[PDB]
Design a protein around this ligand. Sequence first.
Ligand SMILES: Nc1ncnc2c1ncn2[C@@H]1O[C@H](CSCC[C@H](N)C(=O)O)[C@@H](O)[C@H]1O
Ligand SMILES: O=c1[nH]c(=O)c2ncnnc2[nH]1
Length: 241
Amino acid sequence: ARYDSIGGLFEDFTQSAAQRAIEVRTIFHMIGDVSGKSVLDLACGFGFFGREIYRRGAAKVVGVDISEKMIELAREESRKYGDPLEFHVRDVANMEPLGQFDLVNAAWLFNYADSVENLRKMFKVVRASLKPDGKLVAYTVDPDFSLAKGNFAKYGVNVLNERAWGPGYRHDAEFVTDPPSQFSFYRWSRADYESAIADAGFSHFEWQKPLLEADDIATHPPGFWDVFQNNCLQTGLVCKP
Ligand SMILES: Nc1ncnc2c1ncn2[C@@H]1O[C@H](CSCC[C@H](N)C(=O)O)[C@@H](O)[C@H]1O
Ligand SMILES: O=c1[nH]c(=O)c2ncnnc2[nH]1
């Protein structure tokens, strides 16, 4: 797993990157009230979203990540704060079923699907993890991002290159940390995303623009967020059965 070489550097990135405040805001806007809900946090990392979701009143939270190192960090955080989160080390595309939850949160899951086949498998895994009145809140790469139109390094993610990869694109990137933290991800088209959504049995979906606000524009130099607005690397996505 690539994040075995990243580990605690990823938290360092989430603490310094200008984009992270916007994405956290957008994800919790999509999620809404979590009181009493059962929650599955996929590609959970050290557990940031699942753990905050528990802090905001969720009844039960389970996290899944492919990286042993990130899950080791996730379990140590749960021990440090005595919380009841449970974690699994699994590739979500081929995950054993964990049952049906009220809410699946998937922040930076689908951009690790290395083929359209695996993108479609992940969406079927999510649907199988959802109650009939549940929902998926997801955060992923905006299909429309184009590296030539503006890099994201000033927002925390230095995208190093862009290569055709079958029907999509493959990016090598690094989080802006000390030292930089290398990772690779995939940019699948909007059509392929929506087909995976439809064929996984989600009859409703909505793309969500990141929630950049007046105060964010106020406290950076004018135009700082221009690339973020006209070449956004990130998008929200809400799906319901
Ligand atoms: N196929 C897969 N299944 C599960 N987790 C995966 C995966 N591919 C990548 N990941 C994990 O996805 C994470 C992306 S970083 C996002 C971490 C966390 N959701 C947060 O936002 O704070 C990494 O921890 C990585 O190990
Ligand atoms: O936390 C993140 N994980 C990612 O995989 C990612 N990919 C692109 N841009 N930002 C990201 N942020």
